[PDB]
């Protein structure tokens, strides 16, 4: 049936009867000897359908001639047997029964509706106590559950003026009595009666439920099941097994239990069993229906085996083995296979070799399609036989069929889109799949027994799509960053490194070659060495600014190898790229430059030629590795013999009591580390120095042709940390608890490691293996959460027309910059007219894409901050405008309309998740910005800012440096001084927080008493002490309310006023303070009154995206004004924030042990830090704005990848952020029909406000709410996508009571229902459909 929407709602019992074709009565299915289905059973022929293909069970008719007729020998209707999988039946329960889902969801829907606690409703339902309904003239409330002793009381205290029922019947009467709308009106007016925010919120939930039930056609009793439909039998087959037995079916047995119990209940009610017996039977029947529905939510699941609980309907719906993730989202496909791959170097980039057998077994129908077309076979009957005959002509048919038909190759696990690619197949004799070398990097495919699967695209559009989108040559750039995915392999780069290297003295040196060809001939004649230095006439072509090549020829000083390689580089590049010994880095940029200039078509052939030449000349190199090649520097034995001795001295101090326990450890380990560094440096120096050669006279050294050195230097394999372990010393190790081993592994793998050294090494080896095995799962789970939160976004419009954006600046943290501006701003569009450095002069237009040329132009200028449009800020409803997303990183141009950015971004974030871990510097100008300080005894800025951060306009006017000068720091280098690297900029007390005054003047312990607020310490070190202030916790109110104060006093009655300020120089003391300037002491400006003494990898981002609140919430101040205290710390302290024009008592409870960044009179603003530690993304969004929270999220999620060396384009994160805050919470209901306070999807609230303001009525006001991905994925307005993700047993009820309807917008829903996705070519079709409408 054609459809355009899916609607979910409660099913009325008469609707269930409409579904059913019969009532199953006998709990029997088939005989145990004959295989006929028993009538009126779970497999009744006349109820669900005939078993025979087109014959009735009774055998009266066996032809289409009697199709649709009804037999009277057995009663079965004869038609297509397939209908047997669609007809349902129904069981009419002898008594009502509560639907388990609606009874025990996350809240209790039946309980919420009746406002009755879940425990009490469960107690009623399982027949434990009565509940009075229609209590009439009795002191018995509306529900007022009452126990059996209480019922025994009511039975005689009152007569029949009360009714007290038991179980679901009473609940059904309550449901049947619900005056829903009147109840909702009463509760929505009672809401204004009180402010109980511990009850207003649940009251809002209850009224929302009442409104949802009112609006939907649902009726309360539909939460209580009365007729239970039975599944069509063909969906629960009783399949036989080996021998005369049928395989056990869980649902069949659950239905059998339910039917037997219910029939017993009917029998008793017919025979008038006593009340106790019928009550027990009704309880058992209810619990059996419970087991049928959601087995496991019971006290204990039932089982028919060795405690293997039976799967219920809700079990089959959800779960990793459930339908959603097992059969709908991912399903097994025909025309596919798998095999062990192997490397075929001869293949072109766009080809792959497949075995003849696999080709024949995949392309069978195509072969039939030729055997008839060739006329060589009569029909399928003979065509299949001929294919079986493997006739030599059949191979000619296969060689013709497979000519231009792509095949998809799909190694699994396919983390990113580059893991599935199309290849033109070529037949191969063997049974392994021939893969290309350059592609194996994309698949991350090591050929050490790695299986891979092939799928054959059948239809025409499928072939075209494979060739146009998934072809190998169409995926040369990585979508995660401007990085080629065809980065040269490990062996090829070794070959090129060996070929282009140069030696001091070599055969054929110094002559003149007339051209590269003559060089090659010389080498192949053996007259010259490859590394020989020579002068060859080179000719190069450079395409002009218009685009036509200009030929220039010159003599060039180079090497024979470089001149040979130049015969492969295309005609558009400068010779300077090949005049250097190429390595895995140097070659890569080379290839990129080719793609930058020549284009895709020259680039692919150039890559293939590079691979060919590299393989050939690496084979010629014969760069073997042997034990002779691992070099131990001779000085190493000395470096050990000294260093260990030094540890002995550190031991001798410990032998003399001259050192502490810890200091001995942290001196020994540092000396060992210094020794390891010396050993490594000597080893590396020896490795490079091992080559010295005579150039016609006198020995001269040069770079080393040592095998290990060329492997390391070319970047193929074995970096410095590897050669260091192979030839230096293995070094220190860590215990499973992480402690550094005091005795390092002083050996290296060339020498033998002893038994203890190896046992030490096992700790690290197994820790790493376990880390991998555990993190490989969390990475995948993060990928799933990302795709299920961002699956919806597609570039569905060209320009949104907005003009906002985000400002991009180079990352300057920890002093020097960690990344440039070009990386951030490349590939985005400008937010507004980019301006020239200075004033009144613009440089770039307001909506121009900043491609490479404009990035160079900006880097030419001193522009550091550039505002560019971002996907988060795009104002497109239910989609994303193209201009914000900008460049398609895999294509170079702007992204097309119709691309599924969401899945691409999720894969880009999730692919490197297995790479994480689950376990003044330069001269400049001083730029204190955020300065909130005063002046001291030097006036070097009495730092009064918990903000002030001095920046550093470089010699090129570029901030390359800046950090946060903490409160109370003295700025030695301030007021824009120029200071050289390493010259102390500022000073701080690293241990305690000091408090300082502004004026110079006398002080007294105002309102302070010894013993009451300070302790008369002695300072046993000298006997003269600095008084210690009593804390609030160490003293009662006689000292808590007597808060210490060090207000500055003078003879005039007031302090020297700052112009326009009336505040006296009142100063105070917090807890743990140490104060010296006692009474009668003159405190100068800047004098310290007193002093007060005091992370992760993959989880650090997983909890960031989930937006978990920090364990140590750094409290950010809100609004603004000047802070105050309320009442002291009892239970937990209470404080108040005062703005004259504002909430002067903005109060807030505070933890006692968290030190406060403000004490009693500190100017505060929204977002001002009161305590240190990580912030809260929810609070950040609420207090500093969307751009601020976006910047926080992007930077704190990039600090994890930058540490680990992974590069991901920043845009790929913002899309996820756009998904987190897709919801908004209403502040004022306004003229919109929205509730007074409710969370509504931000798109809907925005569109409503748009039309409302177009009509001039009061648009709604809202705060965008940051929901974590795990919840935002389930919070969507399309129940199919949410229920497909997790907590299906919850969502499939929450949406059911709401009468939800799905428009099937998004990718996942369309994938479920088997139609074209609304992206790519599917988006083209949908867009055509909507435009032609």
């Amino acid at each position: 049936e054609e459809f355009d929407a899916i609607k979910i709602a409660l099913a009325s019992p008469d609707m269930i009867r409409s579904w059913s074709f019969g009532e199953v009565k006998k709990p029997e299915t088939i005989n145990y000897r004959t295989f006929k289905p028993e009538r009126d059973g779970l497999f009744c022929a006349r109820i669900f359908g005939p078993v025979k293909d087109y014959e009735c069970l009774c055998g009266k008719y066996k032809r289409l001639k009697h199709r649709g007729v009804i037999c009277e020998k057995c009663g079965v209707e004869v038609t297509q047997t397939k209908v047997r999988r669609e007809r349902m039946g129904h069981i009419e329960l002898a008594s009502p029964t509560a639907h388990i889902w609606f009874l025990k969801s996350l809240p209790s829907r039946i309980g919420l509706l009746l406002d009755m606690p879940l425990r009490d409703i469960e107690r009623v339902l399982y027949f434990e106590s009565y509940v009075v309904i229609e209590g009439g003239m009795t002191n018995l409330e509306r529900q007022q559950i009452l126990t059996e002793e209480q019922y025994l009381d009511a039975l005689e205290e009152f007569g029949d003026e009360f009714d007290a029922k038991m179980g679901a019947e009473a609940i059904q009467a309550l449901l049947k009595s619900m005056d829903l709308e009147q109840e909702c009106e009463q509760l929505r007016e009672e809401l204004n009666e009180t402010n109980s925010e511990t009850k207003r919120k649940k009251l809002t939930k209850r009224i929302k439920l009442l409104e949802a039930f009112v609006q939907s056609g649902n009726k309360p009793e539909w939460m209580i099941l009365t007729v239970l439909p039975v599944l069509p039998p063909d969906l629960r087959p009783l399949v036989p097994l080996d021998g005369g037995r049928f395989a056990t079916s869980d649902l069949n047995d659950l239905y059998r239990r339910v039917i037997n119990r219910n029939n017993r209940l009917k029998r008793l009610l017919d025979l008038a069993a006593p009340d106790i017996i019928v009550r027990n039977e009704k309880r058992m029947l209810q619990e059996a229906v419970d087991a049928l529905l959601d087995n496991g939510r019971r006290g204990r699941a039932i089982t028919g085996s060795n405690k293997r609980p039976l799967k219920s309907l809700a079990d089959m719906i959800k779960g990793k083995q459930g339908r959603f993730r097992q059969n709908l989202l991912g399903k097994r496909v025909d025309y596919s296979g798998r095999s062990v791959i192997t490397v075929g170097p001869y293949l072109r980039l766009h080809q792959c070799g497949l075995p003849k057998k696999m080709a024949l077994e995949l392309f069978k129908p195509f072969i039939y399609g030729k055997l008839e077309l060739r006329g060589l076979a009569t029909t399928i009957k003979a065509a299949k036989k001929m294919v079986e005959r493997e006739e030599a002509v059949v191979w000619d048919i296969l060689d013709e069929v497979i000519r231009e038909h792509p095949v998809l190759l799909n190694r699994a696990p396919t983390l990113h889109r580059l893991g599935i690619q199309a290849f033109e197949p070529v037949l191969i004799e063997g049974k392994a799949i021939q893969l290309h070398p350059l592609v194996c990097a994309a698949y991350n495919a090591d050929f050490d027994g790695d299986q891979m699967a092939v799928h054959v695209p059948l239809t025409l559009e499928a072939q075209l799509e494979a060739r146009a989108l998934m072809m190998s040559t169409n995926n040369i750039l990585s979508p995660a960053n401007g990085e080629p995915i065809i980065v040269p392999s490990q062996d090829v780069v070794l070959g090129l490194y060996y070929m282009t290297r140069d030696c001091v003295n070599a055969k054929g040196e110094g002559m003149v070659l007339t051209g590269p060809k003559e060089a090659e001939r010389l080498y192949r004649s053996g007259l010259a060495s490859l590394h020989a230095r020579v002068k060859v006439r080179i000719t190069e072509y450079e395409k002009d600014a218009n685009g036509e090549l200009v030929a220039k020829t010159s003599l060039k000083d180079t090497t024979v190898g470089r001149a040979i390689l130049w015969m492969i580089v295309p005609k558009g590049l400068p010779y300077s790229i090949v005049n250097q010994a190429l390595g895995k880095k140097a070659i890569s940029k080379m290839l990129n430059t080719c793609y930058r200039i020549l284009g895709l078509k020259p680039t692919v052939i150039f890559a293939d030629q590079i691979m060919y030449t590299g393989f050939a000349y690496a084979a010629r190199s014969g760069a073997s590795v042997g034990i002779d090649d691992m070099v131990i520097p001779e000085k190493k034995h000395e470096i050990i013999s000294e260093a260990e001795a030094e540890v002995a001295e550190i031991q001798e101090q410990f032998q003399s009591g001259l050192v502490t326990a810890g200091e001995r450890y942290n001196k020994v380990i540092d000396i060992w580390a210094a020794a390891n560094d010396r050993v490594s440096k000597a080893m590396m120096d020896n490795l490079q120095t091992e080559t010295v050669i005579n150039r016609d006279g006198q020995e001269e050294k040069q770079v080393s042709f040592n095998s290990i050195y060329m492997m390391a230097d070319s970047g193929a394999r074995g970096s410095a940390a590897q050669i260091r372990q192979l030839a230096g010393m293995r070094g220190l190790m860590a215990k499973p608890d992480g402690s550094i081993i005091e005795t390092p592994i002083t050996a290296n793998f060339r020498e033998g490691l002893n038994v203890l050294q190896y046992f030490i090494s096992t700790h690290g080896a197994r820790k790493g293996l376990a880390d991998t095995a555990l993190k490989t799962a969390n990475s995948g789970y993060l990928t799933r959460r990302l795709v299920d939160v961002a699956q919806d976004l597609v570039v569905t419009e060209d320009d949104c027309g907005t003009h906002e954006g985000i400002m991009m600046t180079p990352v300057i943290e920890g002093g020097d910059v960690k990344e440039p501006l070009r990386d951030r701003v490349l590939g985005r569009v400008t937010a507004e007219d980019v301006l020239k450095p200075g004033t009144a002069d613009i440089l770039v237009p307001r909506n121009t894409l900043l491609h490479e040329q404009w990035c160079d132009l900006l880097e030419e200028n001193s522009v550091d901050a550039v505002k560019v449009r971002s996907v988060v800020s795009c104002d497109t409803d239910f989609g994303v405008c193209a201009h914000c997303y900008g460049r398609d990183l895999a294509r170079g141009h702007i992204i097309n309309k119709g691309e599924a950015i969401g899945v691409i971004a999720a894969q880009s974030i999730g692919e490197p998740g297995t790479q994480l871990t689950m376990r003044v510097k330069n001269k400049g100008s001083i730029k204190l910005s955020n300065v909130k300080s005063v002046v001291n005894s030097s006036g070097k800025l009495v730092i009064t800012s918990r903000n002030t951060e001095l920046k550093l306009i470089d010699e090129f006017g570029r901030t390359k440096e800046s950090y946060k000068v903490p409160y109370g720091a003295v700025l030695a280098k301030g007021d824009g001084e120029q200071v050289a690297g390493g010259e102390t900029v500022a000073n701080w007390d690293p241990h305690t927080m000091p408090v300082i005054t502004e004026v110079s003047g006398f002080v007294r312990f105002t309102d302070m008493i010894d013993g009451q607020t300070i302790t008369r310490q002695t300072d046993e070190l000298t006997g003269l002490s600095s008084l210690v202030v009593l804390d609030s916790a160490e003293r009662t109110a006689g000292g808590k309310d007597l808060r210490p104060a060090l207000k500055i006093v003078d003879a005039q009655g007031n302090d020297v006023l700052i112009p326009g300020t009336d505040m006296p120089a009142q100063y105070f003391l917090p807890g743990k303070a140490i104060v010296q300037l006692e009474d009668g002491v003159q405190i100068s400006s800047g004098d310290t009154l007193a002093r007060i003494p005091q992370t992760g990898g993959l989880p650090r981002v997983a909890d960031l995206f989930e937006a978990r609140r920090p364990k140590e919430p750094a409290i950010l101040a809100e609004i603004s004004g000047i802070v105050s205290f309320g009442k002291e710390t009892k239970g937990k302290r209470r404080l108040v924030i005062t703005p004259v024009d504002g909430s002067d008592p903005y109060e807030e409870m505070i933890p006692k042990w968290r030190q406060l960044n403000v004490f009693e009179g500190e100017r505060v603003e929204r977002g001002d830090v009161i305590s240190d530690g990580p912030e809260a993304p929810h609070d950040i969004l609420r207090l500093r704005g969307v751009h601020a929270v976006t910047r926080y999220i992007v930077n704190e999620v990039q600090d994890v990848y930058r540490l680990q060396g992974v590069k991901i384009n920043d845009k790929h994160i913002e899309v996820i952020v756009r998904q987190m805050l897709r919801k908004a919470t209403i502040v004022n209901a306004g003229s919109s029909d929205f509730l007074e306070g409710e969370q509504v999807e931000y798109s809907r609230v925005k569109i409503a406000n748009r039309e409302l303001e177009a009509n001039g009525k009061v648009g709604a006001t809202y705060s965008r709410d940051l929901l974590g991905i795990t919840k935002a994925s389930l919070a969507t307005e399309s129940f199919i996508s949410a229920a497909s993700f997790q907590e299906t047993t919850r969502v499939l009820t929450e949406a059911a009571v709401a009468g939800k309807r799905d428009e099937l917008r998004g990718l996942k829903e369309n994938v479920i229902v088997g139609r074209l996705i609304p992206a790519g070519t599917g988006y083209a079709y949908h867009q055509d459909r909507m435009r032609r409408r």
């Binding site: 459809f3 355009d4 929407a5 899916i6 979910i8 709602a9 009325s12 579904w19 669609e86 889902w101 439909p229 599944l231 069509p232 063909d234 969906l235 087959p237 399949v239 529905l293 309907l313 339908r323 959603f324 059969n327 991912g330 399903k331 097994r332 496909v333 025909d334 025309y335 596919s336 296979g337 798998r338 095999s339 696999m358 077994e361 129908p365 195509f366 396919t414 983390l415 092939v454 799928h455 695209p457 059948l458 239809t459 559009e461 799509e465 989108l469 998934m470 599924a900 999720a906 059911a1296 994938v1311 229902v1313 088997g1314 074209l1316 996705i1317 992206a1319 790519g1320 070519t1321 599917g1322 079709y1325």
Partner: protein, 99 residues
């Protein structure tokens, strides 16, 4: 191993899985995401309706492929209908809609 056509499962008509059984490779959720990363929609529709699930469609496709037409009629994946029955067996009336 490679499979063109053969055994099909009963409860849902997807092809069997395994080597000892003439089964086809499973197209997992990650592969679906990768296909969606490209614009390939026809590929996905084929892969999840004709190749695997729509019983009537996969025969009309077989006939067209033998005839050399290379056109598919997707219809609807049977497994989804099974799901509907599985939810309709509960107290839930979920149904398709016209508009």
């Amino acid at each position: 191993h490679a499979r063109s056509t053969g055994s099909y499962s009963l409860v849902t008509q997807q092809p069997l899985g395994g080597k000892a059984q003439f089964g086809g490779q499973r197209f997992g959720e990650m592969e679906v995401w990768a296909l969606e990363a490209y614009g390939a929609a026809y590929t996905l529709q084929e892969m999840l309706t004709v190749k695997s699930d729509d019983v009537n469609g996969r025969t009309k496709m077989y006939k067209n492929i033998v005839d050399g037409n290379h056109q598919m009629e997707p219809g609807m994946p049977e497994s989804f209908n099974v799901l509907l029955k599985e939810i309709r067996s509960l107290g839930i009336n979920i149904e398709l809609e016209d508009e």
